[PDB]
């Protein structure tokens, strides 16, 4: 017998492969499984892990995020890498010339990148001009902006969003939300 | 694939400890000590016998 100091037969708790059965995403995993196993470059190990992530763990990156990341000092000619979808932003006043590698581009995003003199390439095209991810800059989208996160950790004096179907004066505003109706939490 | 005891396998013993050969060659396991025949308890240590 053993006095176990840790739980036995515990899976790592991390994805080792995509849940998707898309054969073309598997080809990308095929490529970066080889790169992460053989280049010692930390970029390739990060990309391989990011290819496993679920949809909510790869939030869309607006074309405005890329513009702000390219506006860092000395990052104007870096290659923007987004493991996911790049969406358009009609609130931008202008976009620079840039090279961006992404899983997917929206019609507006592809139009805008190419309209301003840039390139919209896929992640396999990245691996040939940057097999170690040289002079790259990984951009991730906002994770805590999701609507489901509004209701996470709800409680008294927690300031989160109640799970409710209708909104108005008659819907969860009287007792427990108002000192005139007893207490407020 | 198979652990071999250096206390049983002499080749493994020499692989791990090259000095064992000299230990065997010099008979370090039965080395004599050179000293005089003395008895330093003749005096006050006979307090062990009685008190």
């Amino acid at each position: 017998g053993r006095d176990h100091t840790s739980k036995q037969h515990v899976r790592s708790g991390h994805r080792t492969a995509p849940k998707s059965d898309n054969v073309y995403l598997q080809l990308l995993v095929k490529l970066y499984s080889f790169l992460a196993r053989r280049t010692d470059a930390p970029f390739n190990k990060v990309i391989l892990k990011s290819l496993f992530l679920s949809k909510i763990n790869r939030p869309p990156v607006s074309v405005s995020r890329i513009s702000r990341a390219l506006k860092q000092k000395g990052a104007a000619e870096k290659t923007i890498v987004v493991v996911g979808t790049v969406t358009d932003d009609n609130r931008l006043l202008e976009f620079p010339k840039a090279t961006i590698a992404a899983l997917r581009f929206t019609a507006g995003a592809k139009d805008r990148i190419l309209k301003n003199g840039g390139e919209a390439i896929t992640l396999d095209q990245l691996a040939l001009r940057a097999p170690k991810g040289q002079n790259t800059l990984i951009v991730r989208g906002p994770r805590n902006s999701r609507e489901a996160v509004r209701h996470f950790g709800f409680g008294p004096h927690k300031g989160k969003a109640p799970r409710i179907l209708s909104k108005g004066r008659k819907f969860e505003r009287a007792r427990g939300r108002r000192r005139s109706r007893g207490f407020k939490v | 694939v198979l652990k071999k005891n250096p206390l049983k396998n002499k080749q493994v013993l020499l692989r791990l400890n090259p000095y064992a050969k000299a230990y065997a060659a010099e008979k370090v396991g039965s080395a004599k000590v050179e000293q005089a025949k003395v008895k330093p308890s003749k005096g006050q240590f006979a307090e062990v016998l009685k008190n």
């Binding site: - | 652990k3 250096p6 206390l7 005096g43 240590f45």
Partner: protein, 233 residues
């Protein structure tokens, strides 16, 4: 393809032969180093023993009493099963890496570790191990923790690759570092996987779980730890 694979095998065999020639030539010097180290360790063991013997004889002659230096090393064997252990001695046994019956570990005696072993005392048998006992333990049941795996100490390269930054290049360097409690006792003893001993050949006493003083097996037996380890290893 027969002649292709034969050519490749003979070419790689020649390259392997040359590389092994060079490697053996380079390793000869390292083996001379560890040979000299082992000889020096044997010499200092003998010198210290004779010095202590002479000091005892001189104190006997000069109407004095030589008081031995207190032991700096102890070998602790868990002789109790894993059931019905209170949380504090259970945690103490876990932190000593004694998580099974007949598991052995080396402990450097101070105050913190002494009060630890005092907490685990009703469940362990421990004592002061001799050099031959340490050698036999490390030779037969010596394993290292390599990438959290239990690897047999079957070659000095494993020891060098894991303890060369602590000036341990051989199994005898490791034994010396354990026996004469050295500056790197912590790293060397934690690198050592807990010894997994068998039951004694000849059995225990009639009832284990009482102090060695009262006719049982737990507590400090000191020089009889060597006989107990001889029974169990």
């Amino acid at each position: 393809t027969l002649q292709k694979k034969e050519k490749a095998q003979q070419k790689t065999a020649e390259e392997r032969a040359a590389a092994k020639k060079v490697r053996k030539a380079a390793n000869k010097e390292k083996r001379k180093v560890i040979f000299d180290r082992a000889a020096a360790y044997q010499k200092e063991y003998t010198e210290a023993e004779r010095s202590v013997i002479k000091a005892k004889r001189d104190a006997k002659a000069s109407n004095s009493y030589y008081v031995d230096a207190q032991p700096k090393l102890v070998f602790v064997v868990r002789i109790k099963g894993i059931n019905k252990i209170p949380p504090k001695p259970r945690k103490v046994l876990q932190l000593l890496r004694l998580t099974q019956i007949n598991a052995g570990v080396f402990v450097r005696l101070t105050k913190a570790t002494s009060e630890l072993i005092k907490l685990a005392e009703p469940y362990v048998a421990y004592g002061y191990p001799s050099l031959s006992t340490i050698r036999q333990l490390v030779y037969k049941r010596g394993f290292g923790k390599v990438n959290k795996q239990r690897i047999a100490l079957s070659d000095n390269a494993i020891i060098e690759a894991n303890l060369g930054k602590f000036n341990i290049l051989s199994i005898e360097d490791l034994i010396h570092e354990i026996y004469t409690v050295g500056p790197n006792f912590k790293q060397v003893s934690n690198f050592l996987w807990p010894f997994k001993l068998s039951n004694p050949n000849g059995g225990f006493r009639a009832r284990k779980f009482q102090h060695f003083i009262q006719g049982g097996d737990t507590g400090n037996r000191e020089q009889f730890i060597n006989a107990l380890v001889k029974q169990m290893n």
